[PDB]
Design a protein around this ligand. Structure first.
Ligand SMILES: Cc1cccc(C(=O)O)c1OC(=O)C1CC1
Ligand SMILES: [Ca+2]
Ligand SMILES: [Ca+2]
Ligand SMILES: [Ca+2]
Ligand SMILES: [Ca+2]
Ligand SMILES: [Zn+2]
Length: 316
């Protein structure tokens, strides 16, 4: 909308108060003009037609329970923008400050979030498996990273390129969580999964097997469900990325950690310069080793750790 930029206040899904950038034109809309060509958050009103209506509020105060998913989708889209701009010099998902759009209250009791090719979409959860999914910053940043991947490597969402697509979203989702520094971890979705159960998550990067995903190529899934295991086999790559950053010994193979900033640099470079739509795991290894060689030199610790990490998860 055309209007004047202002700053509203509200509470997110977990009850935290935060300020949000809004736009005033009769109503106050969830339109942040301070980032690129805008971040825009929409109400799908429990239906499935998208994007729905640009979120409007009469008084620029967002403290209603119905407001909470919108506040977080909006706020965390901003934090993610900031991450990509400040850490990788990338402006929005297309690198040209494309408008970021999100819709919340998608469908009824809907336990998923996704990127639909044009925007982010969040269900409210059914209250048992999930609470509103924009309440997790790693969820929001995972979805916006699907947009980054689509504009860069374009990894097809099937089989090994699909599992890499998924792991890239888990990796940068987690790096954004760490950038924002509130209760960061290498788990995915913990802030919105199973409100009845503490300490679990949808996936773990540090130990994928805890939630049934493989941590070694030899345990990869080869059937056809989940588009060929894209959310499953992503555990192999998630494990490698965890080891590259934090290090460890896995099936007897030791990895020296090099930290999250260098992890992010190496995988951002592989994502934007070397991976292609049909890259497989072995090709990812090659791209990450070359990216690290580019950045730190062929005989660096960084290169050595990338190789050790891929070795530890059985990827040659
Ligand atoms: C919750 C969910 C369901 C289906 C697909 C995705 C998807 O984005 O691939 C999804 O989100 C995630 O995987 C992580 C939690 C954000
Ligand atoms: Ca209000
Ligand atoms: Ca966390
Ligand atoms: Ca997390
Ligand atoms: Ca839980
Ligand atoms: Zn995903």
């Amino acid at each position: 909308i055309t209007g004047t930029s202002t700053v509203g206040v509200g509470r997110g899904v977990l009850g935290d108060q935060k300020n949000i950038n809004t736009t005033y034109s009769t109503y106050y809309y969830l339109q942040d003009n301070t980032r690129g060509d805008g971040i825009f958050t929409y109400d799908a009103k429990y239906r499935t037609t998208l994007p729905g209506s640009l979120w409007a509020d009469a008084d620029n105060q967002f403290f209603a329970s119905y407001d909470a998913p919108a506040v977080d989708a909006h706020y965390y889209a901003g934090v993610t923008y900031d991450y990509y701009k400040n850490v990788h010099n990338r402006l929005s998902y297309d690198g040209n400050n494309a408008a970021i759009r999100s819709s919340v209250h998608y469908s009824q009791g809907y336990n998923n979030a996704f990127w639909n090719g044009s925007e982010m979409v969040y269900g409210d959860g059914d209250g048992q498996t999930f609470i509103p999914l924009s309440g997790g910053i790693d969820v929001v940043a995972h979805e916006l990273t699907h947009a980054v991947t689509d504009y860069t490597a374009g990894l097809i969402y099937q089989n090994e390129s699909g599992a890499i697509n998924e792991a890239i979203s888990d990796i940068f989702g987690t790096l954004v969580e760490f950038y924002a520094n509130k209760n960061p971890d290498w788990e995915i979705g913990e802030d919105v999964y199973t409100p009845g159960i503490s300490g679990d998550s949808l996936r773990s990067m540090s130990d994928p097997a805890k939630y049934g995903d493989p941590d070694h190529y030899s345990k990869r899934y080869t059937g056809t469900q989940d588009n060929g295991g894209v959310h499953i086999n992503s555990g192999i790559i998630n494990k490698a990325a965890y080891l590259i950053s934090q290090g460890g010994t896995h099936y007897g193979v030791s990895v020296v950690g090099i930290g999250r900033d260098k992890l992010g640099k190496i995988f951002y470079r592989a994502l934007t310069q070397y991976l292609t739509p049909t890259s497989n795991f072995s090709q990812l290894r090659a791209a990450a080793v070359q990216s690290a060689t580019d950045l730190y030199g062929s005989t660096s610790q960084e290169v050595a750790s990338v190789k050790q990490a891929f070795d530890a998860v059985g990827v040659k």
